[PDB]
Design a binder for this molecule. Structure first.
Ligand SMILES: Nc1ncnc2c1ncn2[C@@H]1O[C@H](COP(=O)(O)OP(=O)(O)OP(=O)(O)OP(=O)(O)OC[C@H]2O[C@@H](n3cnc4c(N)ncnc43)[C@H](O)[C@@H]2O)[C@@H](O)[C@H]1O
Ligand SMILES: Nc1ncnc2c1ncn2[C@@H]1O[C@H](COP(=O)(O)OP(=O)(O)OP(=O)(O)OP(=O)(O)OC[C@H]2O[C@@H](n3cnc4c(N)ncnc43)[C@H](O)[C@@H]2O)[C@@H](O)[C@H]1O
Lengths: 394, 394
């Protein structure tokens, strides 16, 4: 029974899952947390938060590897999948990791400095601990490389694009890819003659228009700061406003970068929390700013969904996913009601069903566009890419 | 035969028109140009670019007033209309200018520092030269004051809004207002049960959703830099990209403000011109970057039109206006073809008609949404506001 080990090695953590190759079910999951800090620790299945004070990325993954061998999983690891934050223009699909791929991930790493170097740290650690195991890189940008220039260009001088690589990349590509594929089955659509909008609504949030199987528009930019308002991120913000703020308060770009990334969005408007459940309850209890944060959140989602539909010839389906898209009955309803202009009709009993009901249609039959919830599974998508690549003769 | 004198007193110029009260036709127009510079001059009807070296705003307007009295128009000036760039949250409609209005325009002027002080200079000059004449202020922001919080809030911390007044204001309000009113007549729509999108496409460009007569979404922000890509303005740009550029090139916010406002957009992508006619011809002649600039321009327009439709219950009409919207056969067609997802059908023979044909429907009958061109007339709108206010007992 071979397994796939899937790794997402971030700035401050390493999330991992072990998936059975045959069923793509999780056999083990966990997270090394507080990385590059004094108090690091490893918690598997939320079972025994074991301390690992002062540990590098290879130490953390060696710890993880130890827990795998103690459960006799080490000898069944046939593939390792690494989530990579940014593939620039060099990656359009998942690849078997070689010296070339490593060099190329390093070349594009200036586009996502923090996150990509953590991903490379994860690759170096895994290559050390599993050298007879094929390893695969899956990029959060690659699904969006089918965007046309008119959809990826900013209105900046041409030199910023051609010399510096400033353009829209988009993220959540692995989620958008997985969820769109699942939608063709759920909605009984011909992949090659289809228009979908996927709303990945999590702590990070983005929209993607998928025309005939290909990403043709997405809401995040060169960085994850563009598009939808999110848990702590502003989303779209007038650059004139930001420059005006700078002059008025004496803050720098780096100061405002932090504000916009870490103190903004649902947190910033509500003054309470980035957590939608907290804010949903706060509104229920009469909190006005919580209500304003949610309404603002919903408004910007409706606006991007409708806007992204412009890149479709025909809108067949709108698919909600992510922690909010999967679990927020209210947010899904408010968004759909904000899109009556597209002829959407909600079946509220179907919309009320909890996420235990899995892949599910939430629109009424008279709806001009099908609406559905499809739980995302990025680890499964990575594992499937790795399994296909496992057949390759390199 | 009373006339209205209409003034738009900008950073470097004073545009004026004299309109007959009875017909709202222009009797005289002109522009004092190169203001606050060594070589200033006044050109009426493009007839004799008369020099006015080293002249203040009152000198320029005194020059203009001289040309009015030489044509015996001075004694028929019954009303003066002033275009004001920014009314903040204080102005929701056009007003008779009093000491209070002046104080309030000064209060909100920090939101548009350059432009509003030029407008106030224009008011002081006109009040000096015509003290027995009622004068009226018409704000480019006021039409958009019906926007809901969810549509005007940024995802920044609440303090930026409540203490600093950071929010979406939107501009071209006088154009959007005028054109939407004209559309109810042209499209035989009930103002109170209607959904329109107006695309004001000029050197500055913005979209506005008008639901039941009221602006409910608009594409410009706190400043004119948000939304559509324009002649020299970037439009929407990832703040992460801008911060990344700052770190990479060593430029400051003020440097990037200039790039984004003056070197970006159609100019920036094409490397040729901000002028759409130049770029249309350049594309015709095989220029690839001109083609990319136009396609990008069109893509961002389609995306905002569709997105703004989300704030309507029903989309009845899409109205093109401004220098590009009125005259660009190609851009109108490409935008409409990018919106087939909304069920638009173009009547190409009607779309080919030049702007001499005035207020005109350009959609085919099977179109689910009516598309029209309605030439804007901001001076006429200002004059009409002034004429209504001329009946008031102050
Ligand atoms: N600058 C950068 N450049 C490049 N890459 C970068 C980057 N920054 C980060 N990245 C990378 O991008 C990747 C994705 O990051 P994120 O975008 O942050 O991840 P996510 O999809 O939001 O997943 P997460 O688990 O955080 O949220 P969830 O869907 O559970 O959703 C959580 C939400 O769901 C809500 N929720 C859960 N249950 C709910 C319920 N019953 N009702 C309502 N809401 C509910 C919760 O309240 C919460 O609000 C990462 O690999 C990261 O390293
Ligand atoms: N930071 C700030 N804050 C607050 N307020 C501010 C501000 N900056 C500026 N403002 C104010 O905002 C107001 C409006 O400014 P703008 O937004 O710049 O004015 P506009 O509506 O673009 O009018 P303009 O005459 O420049 O362009 P036109 O429609 O002719 O269209 C010209 C275009 O049409 C095109 N065109 C003409 N004929 C064509 C044809 N046949 N085919 C194709 N294109 C054609 C031309 O090529 C050209 O591209 C002003 O009062 C200004 O002071």
């Amino acid at each position: 029974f071979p397994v796939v080990l899937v790794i997402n090695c971030g700035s401050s953590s390493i999330k991992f899952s072990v998936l059975d190759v045959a069923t793509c079910d999780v056999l083990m999951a966990g997270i090394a947390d507080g990385m590059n800090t004094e108090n690091a620790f490893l918690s598997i299945n939320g079972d025994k938060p074991i301390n690992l004070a002062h540990s590098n990325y290879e130490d953390a993954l060696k710890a993880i590897a130890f827990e795998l061998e103690k459960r006799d999983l080490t000898d069944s690891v046939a593939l390792i999948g690494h989530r990579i934050a940014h593939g620039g223009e060099l990656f359009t699909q998942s690849v078997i990791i070689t010296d070339e791929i490593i060099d190329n991930i390093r070349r594009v790493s200036p586009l996502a400095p923090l996150h990509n170097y953590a991903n490379l740290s994860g690759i170096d650690a895994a290559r050390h601990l599993f050298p007879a195991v094929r390893q695969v890189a899956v990029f959060d940008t690659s699904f969006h490389q089918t965007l046309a220039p008119e959809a990826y260009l900013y209105g900046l001088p041409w030199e910023y694009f051609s010399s510096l690589g400033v353009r829209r990349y988009g993220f959540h590509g692995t989620s958008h890819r997985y969820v769109s594929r699942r939608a063709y089955e759920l909605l009984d659509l011909d992949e090659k003659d289809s228009g979908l909008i996927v709303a990945h609504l999590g702590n990070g949030a983005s929209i993607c228009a998928v025309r005939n199987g290909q990403s043709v528009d997405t809401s995040m930019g060169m960085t994850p700061l563009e598009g939808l308002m999110m848990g702590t991120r502003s989303g779209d913000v007038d650059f004139g406003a930001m420059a005006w703020i700078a002059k008025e308060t004496g803050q720098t770009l780096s100061d405002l970068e932090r504000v916009v990334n870490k103190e903004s969005g649902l947190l910033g408007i509500s003054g309470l929390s980035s957590d939608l459940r907290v804010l949903e309850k706060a509104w229920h209890e009469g909190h006005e700013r919580a209500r304003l944060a949610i309404k603002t959140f919903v408004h910007r989602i409706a606006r991007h969904i409708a806007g992204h539909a412009a890149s479709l010839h025909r809108l067949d389906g709108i698919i909600f996913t992510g922690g909010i898209g999967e679990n927020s009955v209210l947010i899904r309803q408010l968004v759909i009601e904000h899109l009556g202009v597209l002829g959407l009709t909600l079946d509220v009993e179907m919309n009320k069903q909890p996420n235990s009901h899995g892949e599910r249609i939430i629109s009424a039959n008279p709806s001009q566009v099908i609406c559905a919830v499809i739980p995302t599974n990025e680890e499964k998508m990575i594992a499937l890419d790795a399994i296909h690549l496992g057949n390759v003769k390199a």
